[PDB]
Amino acid sequence: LLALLFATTAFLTTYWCQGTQRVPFQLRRFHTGIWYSCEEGEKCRSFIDLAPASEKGVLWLSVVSEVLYILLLVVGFSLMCLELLHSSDGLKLNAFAAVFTVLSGLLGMVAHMMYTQVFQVTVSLGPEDWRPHSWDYGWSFCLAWGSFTCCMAASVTTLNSYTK
Amino acid sequence: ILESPYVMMKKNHEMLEGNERYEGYCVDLAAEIAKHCGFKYKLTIVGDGKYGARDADTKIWNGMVGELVYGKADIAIAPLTITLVREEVIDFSKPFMSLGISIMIKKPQKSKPGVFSFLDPLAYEIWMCIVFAYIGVSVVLFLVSIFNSLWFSLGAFMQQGCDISPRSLSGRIVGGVWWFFTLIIISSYTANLAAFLTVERMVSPIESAEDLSKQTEIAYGTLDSGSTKEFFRRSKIAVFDKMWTYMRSAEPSVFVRTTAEGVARVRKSKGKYAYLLESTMNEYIEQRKPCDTMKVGGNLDSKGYGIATPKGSSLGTPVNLAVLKLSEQGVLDKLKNKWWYDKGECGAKDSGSKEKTSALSLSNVAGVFYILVGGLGLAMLVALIEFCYK
Amino acid sequence: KPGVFSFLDPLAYEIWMCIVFAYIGVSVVLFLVSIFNSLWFSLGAFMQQGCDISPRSLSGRIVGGVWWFFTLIIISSYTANLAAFLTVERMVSPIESAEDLSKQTEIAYGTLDSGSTKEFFRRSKIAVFDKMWTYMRSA
Amino acid sequence: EPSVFVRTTAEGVARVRKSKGKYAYLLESTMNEYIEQRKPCDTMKVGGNLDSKGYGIATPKGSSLGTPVNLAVLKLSEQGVLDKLKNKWWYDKGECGAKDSGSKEKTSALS
C-alpha cells in the first residue's frame, strides 16, 4: 500500500524542482511539477513535453514506462486479495503477486531514470527561458524512491511465506 | 554603405559631426587613401542601400554605381564586388580584399547522450573481435575431457576468481594466458578513457563543400537574393550544382530573407542548418558574441573588393598606387586585425586558451542500463522456460 | 582542501544515490534462484574479492556477471575522471609574466583610470603590452 | 644556424623529406598545392596563406589590348574556367588524385 501511495505521489507531484532566476532583472521563483509547471506572481501552467524531438521520443517512452509502473502494482493486490479469499493452491498466485510488483519497480526506476535523463538534458539546454540556479530534486521524488524499497520490503516477506 | 566592420556609426555619432561620426575598416581606409593620395573627403552613405545594380528595363544602375556613373559620388570606398558588368561602367582599383563564398556552421558542442558514448575508447570492431576471441576459449576448456566452463571463462573474464580450475594441465596454462591477455585491455581501457576526459578536442563535422554535396543530415542555405544564389545556379561544377539542386529542392526553403536570419537558423537548428556567406563577414560574425558560429573550409571562389572610381576618372590611378602600397605595407591586414580581432567581440584563440572542463556526467553511464535491464528481461525469459522444464 | 565533500568530487551526488538504487535491484534477482546471504555476495561481486556462493550456470550466473560487468566500467571511469582532475590541476600554473595575461582572459586585469601607467601601455609599441592595452581598452 | 635557406625549390622539398618532417618549408600556395599532388606526395600544405598575392596578366603600359583582356579574365573567373583548369592542371594532371586527401585517416582509437 505505502509503495502504491508514493507511486501516485510521483504522478501527483506538483513541485519537481524549484526554479530560480533571481537575477540582479529581478527575483523569480518557479515550482515546476513532474508535468505541470507551477510558478510564483502565483500561476500554474503545464509546460509538458519540451525540446528536442527525440528527447520527445524519450518522453513517449517515458510515459509508457510510467503507466506500466502503476498497473503492475495493482496485480500484487488482486492476487493477495485472492489469498484472503482462500484464507477466510494459493502459494503460486501469491508468489505471482510479488512477480509483478518486482517487475513494476524495475521498469519504474528506469521510468524515474528516463525522466532524470530528461531533466538533466533539458537543464543542459538551459530551458527556453527558465534555467534555474535550483535543481533541487523532488520532494516527492525522494519519496517516490521510498516507494521502491517499500516494494522490496513487501517482496522479501511474501517469498519468505513461499519457503514454508 | 553602413556595413560592419567597414563603415559604422559611432556611439557618439549624434555628438560628433562630419566624417568623425563614422567608424570602421573602410573609415580608417578612406583616411589612408586621403593620406597617400592627399585629398579632402566626405564620407557619404548610399541612399537606397544598394551596392549598385543595373535595371533590366530602364537599365539604370542604382546604388553607389548609380552614384558614380551619374556623377553623384566622386569615388566609392566601400565593400563592393568587382563584377564584369560593374567593370564596364566604373573603373575599379586592384582588389585589396580577396574573398569568396565561405561555409558558416555552428561551433561544435559536447553532446553524446548514451550507448555510443560508452563505446568510445574501444573501437566497434574490437568489441566484436574480443568476443570472437572469447568464443575460441570455450572448446579448449572442453578439450580437458563446455556449457559449464564457458561461465568460468567468464569467471576468468576479468575478475572473480573461478571455482572450476583444470589444475595443472594445458588448460591451467592457456586459461591463464587468455587471463593474461585480457587484463592488459582493462588497464588500456582506463588509460584511453582518462586521456579522452583529459584533452576534449572538438572534432569539426565537415570541411569541404563536397561534404555538404553528399550528406543531407545538416541543411545549408544562402540568402534568398544575391549573386550567391546566382553563383550556384551559374556553377557548371557538378559539386555545387548538386548543392544548387539541393537548395532548390530544399523544402522548406533554406533561403532566408536577412543575413542574421541565416545566422539565427544556424543557432536555432543547433547545427542542423549551415549557411553560406562571404569569408570576411563569416570571419566577422565568428568574432561577434556569443561566437557559437564558425567558418570551416576555404572559399569556393576567388572574389575581390576593390576601390571604385567612375570610369574615366584619373584619380583612381594613384588610388591604385595607394592600394598596392597599403597591401605591401600590410596596413590592410593590420586594420583587418583591428576591425575583426581587436574590434571583434571574441578573441578566437582567447577562448581557445579557455577550456578547463570538469566532473563526470551521468549520461554516458545511463545508456548501459538498457542492456542491464536487457539482462533483467533475460533473467525472466530463461527462468520462465525453466518452468517448461518443470 | 576539504573533507568528505572532496572525496565525493569525481562522481556526482545523485549518481552516488543511483548506484545504490541500482545495487538494491540485484538483491531479489539473486533470490529468484530459489536474499539476506546473497546480498553480501552482490557486495562480494561489488568490485573485487571473488565470492564464494555462485549460482553456477543459470540466469543468476549471467546477470550476476552483467552487473559485475557494469560496475567495473565505473571504477575505471572514477579513476579516469580523477586522473582527468589531477592532470589538469597540475597543469594550472600561476601567472608568471605579462605574456601570460597577454594571452589568457580568464583573469581580468586593470590599472588606474588615470596615470602614466594608462599612458604607458598606450605608448607601448611592444605588441605584448599593446595587446594588453587593446585588452583593457576593450575590457 | 645552419642555413635553412636553400638554393633551389626542390632542395627545400628534399630537405623536408630528408629531415623527416623536422624541416618545414615556405612557398606559394598553388605550387604548394602542386608539389603536394606530385608523387610520392609525402609533402603537404597546412594553414592558409600568410598574405594576399595575385597573378595577373601583364601587358606593356599604354597598350589598349589589356583592357579586353581584363574583360576576358573576369569572364573566365565568372565562368569558372580558371578553377576548372585548376582542377585540370593540379588534380587531373597531378600525380596524386584529388580524393587522396580524404584518405588521411582520422582520430580513431587504439590501433
Tell me how close the Cα of B303 comes to any Cα of chain C, in angstroms: 31
Within 8 A of B382 by CB-CB distance, chain C residues are 58-59, 62
The one-letter amino acid code at D3 reads: S
Identify the CA nearest to C65 among candidates B248, B67, B371, D101: B371
Task: Report how far apart, in Å, the C-alpha atoms of B123 and of each of B85, B128, B189, B380, D86 are.
Answer: 56, 9, 11, 31, 39
Name the residue among A126, C9, C87, A121 with its Cα closest to residue B200.
C87
- The rounded distance, in Å, linking the Cα atoms of B289 and B269 is 18
Which residues make Cβ contacts (< 8 Å) with residue B184, sequence separation at least 6?
none
The answer to whether the beta carbons of residues B226 and B255 sit under 8 Å apart is no
Q: Do B87 and D70 touch (CB under 8 A)?
A: yes
Q: Are B239 and B208 in contact (CB under 8 A)?
A: no
Given the C-alpha cell 563526470, which residue does it identify? B360
How far CA B247 is from CA of B242, D53, D54, in Å, comes to 8, 33, 33
Distances (CA, A) of D58 to A4, B87, B327, D66, D89: 90, 18, 19, 7, 21
Taking each helix axis from N to C end, the angle separating B369-389 and A91-125, rounded to the nearest 10 degrees, works out to 170
- CA dist., res. A145 & res. A149, Å (int): 7
Interface of C with A in 34-53 (CB under 8 A): 34-35
**Rounded (10°) angle between helices B25-36 and B316-329:** 110
Residues annotated within a binding site of B for L-glutamate: 79, 81, 86, 227-228, 278
Cα gap B127→B265, rounded to integer Å: 39
Place of cell 607601448: C124
Phi first, then psi, for residue A32 (nearest 5°) are -80, 135
Report yes or no: A137 at the C interface, CB cutoff 8 Å: yes
Please give the distance of CA C69 from its chain centroid, rounded to a whole number: 22
Of residues D52, D84, D109, nearest to B123 (C-beta): D109
Q: Would you give the DSSP letter of residue D91?
A: I
Q: Is the CB of residue B40 less than 8 Å from the CB of residue B34? A: yes
Which grid cell sits at D45? 600544405
Whether B363 and A120 lie within 8 Å, measured CB to CB:
yes
From residue A66, alpha-carbon distances to A35, A58, C22 in Å are 12, 12, 18
Taking the CA atoms of residue A130, residue A134, residue A139 and residue A143 in that order, the dihedral angle to the nearest 10 degrees is 110
On whether any CB of chain B is under 8 Å from the CB of A120, the answer is yes
Experimental method: cryo-EM
β-strand pairing of A29-32 with A37-39? antiparallel
Which residue carries 622539398 as its cell? D13
Grid coordinates representing A55 are 528527447
Using alpha carbons, select from B55, B58, B56, B46 the residue that is nearest to residue B3: B46
Contacts with A106 from chain B: Cβ below 8 Å: 373, 376
Q: Are the C-beta atoms of residues B289 and B346 closer than 8 Å to each other?
A: yes
For B40, residues 6+ apart whose C-beta sits below 8 A from its C-beta are: B34
Grid coordinates standing for C124? 607601448
Nearest one of B345, B346, B336, B342 to B26, comparing CA atoms: B336
Residue of chain A whose alpha carbon sits nearest to that of B365: A117
Whether residue B319 contacts residue B33, with contact meaning beta carbons closer than 8 Å, is answered with yes
What phi and psi values does residue B215 have, to the nearest 5 degrees? -80, 160
**Burial tier of B337 (Cβ tally within 10 Å: 0-12, 13-18, 19+):** middle
Minimal CA–CA distance to B205: which of B118, B297, B141? Answer: B297
Q: Which residues contact B253 (CB under 8 A, 6 or more apart)?
A: B221, B224
Check: CB of residue B343 under 8 Å from CB of residue B288: no
Nearest Cα to Cα of residue B103 among B279, B291, B348: B279
Backbone φ, ψ for residue B344 (5° rounding): -75, 155
3-state SS class at C59: helix
Which other chains touch chain C, taking contact as 3+ CB pairs less than 8 Å apart? A, B
With beta carbons less than 8 A apart as the criterion, state whether A16 and A119 touch. yes
Does residue B120 contact residue D109 with C-beta atoms inside 8 Å?
A: yes
d(CA C15, CA B365) in angstroms, rounded, equals 9
Pair B101, B243: CB distance under 8 Å:
no
Q: Which grid cell is A79?
A: 492476487
B135-163: string of b/e by CB count within 10 Å (b at 16+)?
eebeebbeeeeeeebbbbbbbbbbbbebe
DSSP string for residues in B121-159: SS-HHHHHHHHHHHTTHHHHHHTT--TTHHHHHHHTTSS
Contact C28 A152 (CB under 8 A): yes
E runs forming strands in chain B: 8-9, 22-23, 90-92, 97-99, 101-106, 219-221, 273-278, 293-296, 303-305, 308-310
Give me the count of residues in chain A: 164
Asked whether the beta carbons of C10 and C85 are under 8 A apart, the reply is yes
CA atoms within 13 A on the CB side of B221: 26
Does residue C25 sit at the A interface (CB-CB below 8 Å)?
A: yes
Confirm if B53 and B61 have CB atoms less than 8 A apart: yes
Buried b (16+ CB within 10 A) or exposed e, C80-101: bbbbbbeebeeeeeeeeeeeeb
Cα R_g (chain A), whole angstroms: 19
Grid cell digits, residue B206 = 565537415
- Which cell numbers in the block locate residue A118? 530528461
DSSP B166-212: --SSHHHHHHHHHHHHHHHHHHHHHHHHHHHHHS-----S--SHHHH
Instruction: Quote the CA–CA distance of B100 and A132 in Å, as a whole number.
Output: 43
CA distance B224 to B17: 37
Give the count of beta carbons closer than 10 Å to the beta carbon of residue B124. Answer: 10
Q: Are the CB atoms for B101 and B299 separated by under 8 Å?
A: yes
| Nearest CA among B79, B51, B75 for reference residue B63 | B51
- CB–CB contacts below 8 A, B to C: 121
CA distances from B159 to B168, C23, C59 (A): 20, 19, 19
In total, chain D counts a number of residues equal to: 111
> Can you say which residues of B are annotated as belonging to the binding site?
79, 81, 86, 227-228, 278
